[PDB]
Amino acid sequence: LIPHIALIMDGNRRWAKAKGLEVYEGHKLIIPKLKEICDISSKLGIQVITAFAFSTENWKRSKEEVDFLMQLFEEFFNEFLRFGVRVSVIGCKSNLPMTLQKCIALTEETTKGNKGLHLVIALNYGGYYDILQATKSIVNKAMNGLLDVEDINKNLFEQELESKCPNPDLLIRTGGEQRVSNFLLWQLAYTEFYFTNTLFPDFGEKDLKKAILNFQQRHRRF
Amino acid sequence: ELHEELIPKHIALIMDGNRRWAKAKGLEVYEGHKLIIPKLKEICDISSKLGIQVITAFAFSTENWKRSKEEVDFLMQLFEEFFNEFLRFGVRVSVIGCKSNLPMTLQKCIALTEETTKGNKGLHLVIALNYGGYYDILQATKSIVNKAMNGLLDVEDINKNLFEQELESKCPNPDLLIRTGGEQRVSNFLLWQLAYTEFYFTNTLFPDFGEKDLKKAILNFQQRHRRF
């Protein structure tokens, strides 16, 4: 009974403020924390992790914070070039700075043959966005004579979505909020929801093992 | 005590626990199912008094067809009795889900209750019957494809606003989802519409879920609003 885990990595701001640091000090930990969580998850046999790095609503933050995050994401993709996990990105890439677009493309191509755990970064992603782009794609295929309206079913639709099957078995959200905040809407239809007040920079091996134990107990119960 | 200004305007309800409740009570399986009618009357009355404006209740999922034909036939007769009972109850009633797959008498009972209550002025009760989140997104997609193929739509106009016009569960979306029975998942209920909804899970079984349990859920929603 080991879970695909979807991860909403909330609590970085609160963690830094409680410690007396600037806001960016918690964001900055996305790189060592995801390396830490990839190592633990590979040992337990996970398979896929999808991490919500930047929502389509995150553009409404200050330009200084958004500019920091975009530079941080560039450093992230550079650091995962030789880390050994397979890396993919979902989200609208054409709205990102060009250097980030090319770093994403390089890391996706460089790591595409890495074996084992697949880390999916949702960057400029939202559930609405994913469903709408799948809808537009399906409309375009119908208008070009490539599909019939009657062929539009769950199988066809899930092939057009950016987050692919197998869908998450378990969603973990740190930071205490009990909502999904426009993450993987279609893909969460049967996912187990696990919410913890633990802040993301404090989320470690013992916290992940607790979430998996809770997932296993719930599976036996229902 | 609740703050009047922080009452959720739309609550989505997954009504789980009827079978386990009947088993624990020494009753047959159908005894729990039958309570949908008095239970939803009771929750409608409580919700009207607290100022809730919309309740969407998950009565029959697209996966519920996998139960025995005897159980499905019983439920279909129960739903017909439900809509007859709500003809004169005084709330506005709407149904979302695939109606063409339902028995014809039930299709026409649904249609009559929707038409008869469409001018009722308070709480709006939406019954999700032969409904799923996948179904809603797929039928919206098929509708948009059909309009495009019939020359009625410029593809550059396909956006969130257009998509929301085609979905069956409409804005405003649920502020709060309550699921009884202890499971912590949404089980293919209102997928698009739950993007920002607060999730509240309780071990209380649905036939036991009453005024105090609903007030507890609302009180919890308000505290989350203060916190975040």
* Identity at B44, one-letter amino acid code: C
**Max CA separation in chain B (angstroms):** 60
The answer to whether B224 faces chain A, any CB pair under 8 Å, is yes
Give the Cα separation of B228 and B226 in Å (integer).
6
- One-letter amino acid for residue B133 of the chain: G
Alpha-carbon distances, residue A156 vs A213, B138, B193 (angstroms):
34, 10, 21
Provide the terminal-to-terminal Cα distance of chain B, rounded to the nearest Å.
20
β-partners of residue B152 are none
A158–chain B nearest CA distance, Å? 10
Residue A182 region, left (φ>0) first, then alpha (ψ -120 to 50), else beta? left
> What phi and psi, each to the nearest 5 degrees, are found at residue B55?
-125, 125
Indicate if B157 belongs to the active site. no
> CA dihedral defined by B77, B81, B83, B87, rounded to 10 degrees?
160
Tokens representing residue B126 in the block: 């939406």
CB atoms within 10 A of CB B200: 19
Per this entry, what is the length of chain B?
Answer: 228
Catalytic residue among A10, A130, A148, A207: A10
**Top-level class of domain A5-126+169-221:** alpha beta
Which amino acid, B162?
L
Beta-carbon contacts of A138 under 8 Å, excluding residues fewer than 6 positions away, are A147, A152, A156, A157, A160, B141, B145
Q: How far apart are CA B89 and CA A109, in angstroms?
A: 62
3-state secondary structure of A193: strand
Supply B33's token pair.
Answer: 């199912």
How far out from the chain centre does Cα B56 lie? 3
List the structure tokens of A57. 């609503």
Interface probe for A, chosen from B191, B202, B222 (most Cβ of A below 10 Å), is: B191
Pairwise CA distance, residues A36 & A207, whole Å:
12
Instruction: Residue B31: count other Cβ atoms within 10 Å of its Cβ.
Output: 16
- Among A130, A139, A216, the strongest candidate for a mutation testing the B interface, having the largest count of B CBs within 10 A, is A139
Q: What angle do the packed helices A30-44 and A205-221 form, to 10 degrees?
A: 50
Residue B20: which residues within 8 A CB-CB, separation 6 or more?
Answer: B32, B181, B205
Measured between alpha carbons, how far is B206 from B213 in angstroms, rounded to an integer?
A: 10
Radius of gyration of chain A (CA): 18
Distances from the Cα of A139 to the Cα of A19, A128, B70, B158, angstroms = 51, 16, 40, 9
CA distance B166 to B160: 10
Instruction: Please give the CATH number for the structural domain made up of B4-132+172-227.
Output: 3.40.1180.10
Residue B127, class by beta-carbon neighbours within 10 Å (0-12 exposed, 13-18 middle, 19+ buried)?
Answer: buried
CB of B54 closer than 8 Å to CB of B124? yes
* Cβ neighbours of residue A66 closer than 8 Å, sequence gap 6 or more: A58, A59
Structure tokens at B191: 């997928």
Query: Cα(A124)–Cα(B146) distance, rounded to whole angstroms?
Result: 30
A185 touches chain B (CB under 8 A): yes
- In what order do the strands lie in the sheet containing B176-179? B92-96, B124-131, B54-61, B10-14, B176-179, B198-201
A149 at B interface, C-beta within 8 A:
yes
> Which of B141, B158, B199 is closest, CB to CB, to A178?
B199
Residues of B in contact with A194 (CB under 8 A): 184
3-state helix, strand, coil in chain A (%, to 5): 50, 15, 35
For A182, the closest of B138, B195, B200 (CB atoms) is B195
**Residue B158: closest C-alpha in chain A:** A136
DSSP string, A59-123: GGS-HHHHHHHHHHHHHHHHHTTTSSSEEEEES--TTS-HHHHHHHHHHHHHHTT--S-EEEEEE
| Residue B163 with chain A: CB contacts under 8 Å | 131-132, 135
Count of beta carbons in the 10 Å neighbourhood of residue B21: 20
Where exactly are the structural domains of chain A? 5-126+169-221
**For residues B226, B213, A188 and A149, what is the CA-based torsion angle, rounded to 10 degrees?**
-110
- Residue B35 main-chain phi, psi, to 5 deg: -70, -5
Number of C-beta neighbours around residue A68 at 10 A:
16
CB contact under 8 A, A154 and B160: no
Answer yes or no: do A178 and B200 touch at CB < 8 A: yes
Exposed e or buried b per residue across B58-96, where buried means at least 16 C-beta atoms within 10 angstroms of its C-beta:
bbbbbebeeeeeeeeebbbebbbebbeebeebebbbbbb
Say which of B16, B73, B175, B208 is annotated catalytic: B16
SS3 annotation, chain B: CCCHHHCCCEEEEECCCHHHHHHHHCCCHHHHHHCHHHHHHHHHHHHHHHCCCEEEEEEEECCHHHCCHHHHHHHHHHHHHHHHHHCCCCCEEEEECCCCCCCHHHHHHHHHHHHHHCCCCCCEEEEEEEECHHHHHHHHHHHHHHHHHCCCCCHHHCCHHHHHHHCCCCCCCCCEEEECCCCCCCCCCCCHHHCCCEEEECCCCHHHCCHHHHHHHHHHHHHHHHHC
C-alpha distances out from residue A40 to A85, A118, A196, Å: 13, 13, 18
DSSP A157-192: HHHHSSSPSSPPSEEEE-SS--S-TTSSTGGGTTPE
Q: Which residues lie across from A171 on neighbouring strands?
A: A6, A193
- Choose the mutation target among A156, A167, A178 for the interface with B, i.e. most B CBs under 10 Å: A178
d(CA B192, CA A171): 17
Tell me whether the omega of the peptide bond preceding residue B8 falls within 30 degrees of 0, making it cis: no
Cβ–Cβ contacts within 10 Å for residue B28, how many? 11
How far, CA to CA in Å, does B92 sit from each of A151, A208, B53, B54, B127?
36, 46, 10, 9, 11
Give B155-180 as a 3 state SS string: HHHCCHHHHHHHCCCCCCCCCEEEEC
Q: A8 forms bridges with which residues in the sheet?
A: A52, A173
Size of interface A-B (CB pairs under 8 A): 103
Q: Which residues contact A199 (CB under 8 A, 6 or more apart)?
A: A10, A11, A12, A14, A15, A26, A174, A175
**Using the 8-state DSSP alphabet, how is residue A147 labeled?**
-
Report CA torsion sign: B61, B221, B210, B90: negative
User: Which candidate from B155, B186, B192 shows the least CB-CB separation from A131?
Assistant: B192
Instruction: Provide CB contacts within 8 A for A27, sequence distance 6+.
Output: A12, A13, A68, A69, A72
Compute CA distances A71 → A23, A24, A92, B142, whole Å. Answer: 15, 12, 17, 40
Contact A193, B185 (CB under 8 A): yes
Question: What CA–CA distance (Å, rounded) separates A202 from A186?
Answer: 29
Of A75, A79, A62, A77, which Cα lies nearest the Cα of A13?
A62
- Residue A156, amino acid: L
Query: Measured between CB atoms, does B155 come within 8 Å of chain A?
Result: yes
